[model samples]
Target chain A: VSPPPPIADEPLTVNTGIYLIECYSLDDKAETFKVNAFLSLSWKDRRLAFDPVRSGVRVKTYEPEAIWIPEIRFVNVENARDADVVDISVSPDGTVQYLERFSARVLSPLDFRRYPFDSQTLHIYLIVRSVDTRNIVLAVDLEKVGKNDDVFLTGWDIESFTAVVKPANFALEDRLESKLDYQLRISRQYFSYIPNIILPMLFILFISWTAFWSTSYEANVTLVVSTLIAHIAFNILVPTNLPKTPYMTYTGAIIFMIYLFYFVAVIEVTVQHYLKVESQPARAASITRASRIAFPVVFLLANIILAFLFF
Target chain B: VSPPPPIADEPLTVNTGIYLIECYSLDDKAETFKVNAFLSLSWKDRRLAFDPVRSGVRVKTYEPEAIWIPEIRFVNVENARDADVVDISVSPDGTVQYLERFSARVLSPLDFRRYPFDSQTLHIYLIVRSVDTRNIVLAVDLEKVGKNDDVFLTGWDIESFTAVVKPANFALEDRLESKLDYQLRISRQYFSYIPNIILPMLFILFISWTAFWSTSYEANVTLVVSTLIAHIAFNILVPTNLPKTPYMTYTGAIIFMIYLFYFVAVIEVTVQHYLKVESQPARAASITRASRIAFPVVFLLANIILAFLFF
Candidate 1:
């Protein structure tokens, strides 16, 4: 009828576990993931204890309404978990074992600063609130926590799934609350985007450098401006379906740097053509020769620095 | 004691299904993959027919040795499959259902012509040989043939796991044989290779073109030569675990073209310095102006052609 009263004036330790069955639908813009798992809970209720020899049955199943269950919930889920109780078995000493199949849309924050090469620790926070009769604390049953070998998330590689052994116990609304952290470690699979986005973007950027080799104003203008326009078009494709973040991403840094390079390139090409028209051919040639060395060296040096900082 | 005799003087149809569970270990060099799946087979056995009311059992389970089963094998496996019988159930009307869990290292050929941008159709060929008494034909049970939602293959996005449905009936070893084709469609993930391989490689190649802006022969020589050396070093890293094929890969075409570009760059720089030393400043300038357009134009045009051809 109620939660078991503490015999030694200590909080009840509820053993908890989450075994992942299916993992998919990792949405980037929403920063959400859908997960299906088996939730296992165990606790002792001495009120239901009995003599096994007289009962003959070693284990008994009781309806959920007939017994008290800890009010367990997820802290970071978008909605209440859709759950179905699979079984509830009680031992001779009234140790209750609960198994449930549950699905949840978890809202976990992601860090995209090094995105595409990023590794993330997605969280599932399991929490239990204390009942009026007793305070409930949570503990991880390591043996029962795991992910299915076949479990997979699209566009990502699952590295590991584990839970912190210690529970974060704190006071909420003048009552004790216990929280457990379940982590799904994953890294973005980078291969799909390179051929479609990064490589083509790099190729067009390289095309703009060709203007440094030409002296014809007509050819140089079209070479630099046309490539620049193509790059602007390509830029529109990258951020589609992507979240707008305040901080710069690794790819974001490269794109912003490209704009500066294009701006500076136009300036150099214009300066060379103007000096030639003014009959300062010697000065024009000098600047042109200097740019041949400067453009590439600066580009390479900037990339190395960005790679070092990001990687 | 033996395969069921055909009632209509036709081959016996054995319905087959494969449900993938754990799929992993895709080795590129070996062109192999390890898979764990449930293999299901169904057929009718007229001799074992029984009346449910007389036997008081609607269904009966028997050891595999007690009943006749078609000898099935995989066509594309590296070795014999490691399989364990899970269940063999018989209906009152003598219909038989068989299920087994199997692990196998399947040898499937991969096309690396597109390399990191390639899509592949991996095959799992299910075959059955005719017994001395009757020919065993295969049919796909569409409902049971599927993969687990949790099934994840690293470094790949699995597009679909499907069968051809129409069985290949042919003569082999002087006996009638039936074959079914199971295809696993997947496309390579490309983002991982860009920052490490493609981007760095493109940077060095673009640096070589910087020679077009230079009048100093010494600067031109180092600019072209140093980047060429780095490109060679990077090339060594690409083909480490790749197989030797007679055809040119898309990335392979780009690398080979870079070497030609570098060689011509050296010749152009050499010719420019020689003409300037010979007092032919106009001729030297013409070539230098021409090269600035030629190198980048050729590179872009060639890349476009390769993309069109490969895609």
Candidate 2:
């Protein structure tokens, strides 16, 4: 198939749309997701126009090999999309409506600063290059561009599937090209993260605070040291490892804050041990008594500060 | 339009299918959910068949008002489905495929025995009653029987959407009635419940046990009594209520078990107070010492037992 014949010097408008069918495999580490959707393209071709009365059909169906279709492709895909032609129908006026089901793994850059509480914009860039004979310009048809009702992204809630109607026109290799933006908006489901991360983190932390009630230096040493070691063990057990980012993340900051608590816990215990060894039992009790109210208050204050800073 | 004149004594088979589009508002208390889907029915109507060579189209489209379509309805619907006709296409061989887009609130029964750990079977019941002139039978069409990839049910993981191949043919109001079943399988996401319920419950219980380390009866009384009152306050704060059932749910059993822990907590405090007043300081220390390991050991044991019993 070749490019459609144009009667004038003006550019041809290739209408674009994406109807999402399946949304899955949103990988946080890789910043990629898989999409299955129907891509629809519409354009006028006078050569294929027919008289409805003479043709015995109002609409005519054709194979891709038998007609002129402008070359369409995605810009930000991992590889070229695996697409299957679903239908190619032409009305009497030669308005060709072409639909294809495409499966693509899209690569979009993601922000992880507020991860598990982050929102993301997933993008699919649609592009078409102009042929030597005809200049191409793209336009978005809002009705044909939508998602199916069953598009579920694991651990995410999708709010919208929309497009930027204005096409980005540019020149490459002395040929005009047009591109369209298809975007999916989503927010993370943070419910599971509370139980999996923060709840257990707080549990190990509060256990370390139980030392305030104990007068026995051995008992206090055993309690604080065991919880600190357990928190170290907990660090390995609970992580779904992320590639290290130099800047702090919301969860990363909290985990670091817990490390400080452990350090403080160890310092308080050994210092109290030293105070008792120096035969100053009164001041040892003062530190222990001071920490009873201090631990919970300071923990809550830091949590509030961290949340306000991150969000 | 009336049903087609039968050529023989045999009943007509209305090929049936459901194409789910939107699934939402799965209510726990009402045992209902909203579904938006396409309902398709196929049957042969000789009166409408036309020759492709003369009719100007291979397939013909007709309005529902102009066709002899079957009266299909849902059995388990809260009210009659709000449906709009989408398409009616007839092939040259007189095979008519009827489609309607319908929004329905289905009154399906639910089980809450395991609750957050439970699996559910969501059902849609399709049924048809006989016309005075002829009997209508329902048949499942596997190709058209499916859910869209976008069916997002909050806090649920859906596995499959399937139909029962065989229809149940029975007498209703002295006329033959045919019924078919569509089932959707799903599992609850129990992650949120741990932090919302069990984590805090454990926190209060652990805080209550801080009494064992103290020898002051007045101090131990406040610690244990305060945690018990806090547990009672927690019970009121954390529930998204379910109806009172004679049976105990898995989470419900744990809650009831916590009450016993509080009662035992109070008894330990007061009993130790009495033992110290009687001047038996050694045995009072023994009882307090025995409880440190027992609290955690018994808590773990009963949790294991409850989970095993429920699962």
Candidate 3:
């Protein structure tokens, strides 16, 4: 291959602009997601300037490898899932446009404190080193940057996209740098959790309450114990869809509350049985009636307190 | 920069070998780990070979960047957490050796079926494309590849490490392939899980059993309910440290058993009270005595069954 000619000493001005999200998917175990997007870079070069009519052509295009271009790379990329240059073109006034589609696995720090109800921010950083900001001015074409409407994110809603340009110092000998950052905001879609997790759990807790009305000890024991097992099953199921975190989440609090209530019912039944066996029939009857109202009231109050604390 | 001379058509015989794990840590939520290791890549270059004694030197060394080397990259790397080229040296017989220390976050698929007591295989893949297996034959320096004894993995034990070489096809136009893979086997140390999760849970369950000895309804109710709350706290804590999985584990089974046993005690107290309140003191006394013996026996029997089923 022959070396390209380079006579000018002028700094190259490159525009790092435009990002259109094609699709995305989350890797729950890795806390990362693969994002497929069409990225564009445009700039004007005096050396490539031409008159359309005089040149007897409307426009000209060339592959990026065939022309001279600045070295730019995704500095924050964890894994380059897939990348392909779609096209590169130059219009009459040396206006060069380069478009590429890429699917990259990016690392995003996630806080599962709100989990299922959590909102997250994903970032992508583009960098050009050995070239200071004076040589490369990175800018975002905001109007042309957005997510496709047809792209659906499971359990998440696309909120917004924002871009920012900042200077970075490279550790190499030249120590020169320029960077462009793209950020996307997404909030979890928790509507499914209501029916799938919360409602089923509530139903089990309510079924345990029936133990208080059962006359047979075997019947009450069977009902409450079976419900307790079912509750544990639900407890195991919920977290499988969430990232494991050291802190408790709203869903966790609710499960704890249910465990407490079920246990309280077990104690209530025991206390009533003890009172009657010891010949305190009136006291036992009175406490049982009081508990009929007390359990639901305490459960509701506890939920309200938890909601205020977390949400 | 000036282009280098190229005259030979002979294939480059590169030796891709040697990996030492200095330390490793798990990201439970991401199901990956950060591995710190010393990696070496070596090859022979006849052009650079010479009789070193004639030059009054025993060896020659050059920085990796100053020499032409194979383009080998980590295919399984999720994030290059930290990397540094420790040294690059060459021998008198044209043998080039490049050594680097890197801390990388590599993706490792995990199976939590027997978790906390589970054995897992972690993989790291090195790949070179646009170059066929004919030109480059990958080999491992097994003697030099091992984990450091001083490196401690929290809640896990390092078992063994193995390396293999294989061919991989590229998706690009030049249909080329070559790859090297390293596998590490590690097992979870249940030493931590026992004390932190299981033992505390068993303690709570045993305390709940003391409800049989309490003569007063208030005493028994308070004791059992408080123990229940403690058990729930353990339930919430255990899962936060484990990978979220769909199947129930041995720990889950034990918890469910405890819940059942506690609920049974509550019902026993209730039934005994009813018998005495209805003027059947003799019968109530007989049943209570029976329960003192039956409760512990049944609890132990249920656990034995669960142990058989899950462990």
| Best TM-score among the predictions, by candidate number | 2
lDDT of 3: 0.65
Models sorted by lDDT, best on top: 1, 2, 3
Worst 10 residues of 2 chain A by lDDT: A239-248
- For each candidate, give the TM-score of chain B: 0.94, 0.94, 0.76
True contacts kept of each: 0.00, 0.00, 0.00
- Identify the CAPRI category of the predicted complex in candidate 1: incorrect
Better of 2 and 3 by DockQ: 3
Model 1 over residues B178-202: C-alpha lDDT tens digits? Answer: 9999999988776556644566566
- Provide per-model DockQ scores: 0.01, 0.01, 0.07
Writing each residue's lDDT as its tens digit, candidate 2 over B111-172 gives 88898788999999999999888999999988888875746565677889999989999999
User: Which ranges in model 2 have alpha carbons more than 4 Å from their true place?
Assistant: A1-311, B239-241
The reply for model 3, stretches above 4 Å from the true place, is A1-13, A44-54, A75-78, A92-95, A131-137, A165-177, A234-240, B1-67, B70-311
TM-score of 2: 0.61
lDDT value for model 1:
0.81
Candidate 2 chain B least-lDDT 10 residues: B192-201
Instruction: Give the per-residue lDDT of model 2 (tens digit) for A1-311.
Output: 44676787888899989999999998775567999999999999989999999889999999998998887877656445889999999999999999999999876656777977899999898878676557889999999999999999988999999999999898643347798999999999989888887788789899989888876655765565456556655655665545334356777667656756755765676567657767898998899889888888998999899899988
Q: Give one digit per residue, the lDDT tens place, for model 1 in A205-311.
A: 78978877888766775666566656655754565344544456787677667766766776677678767866798988888788888988998899899989998
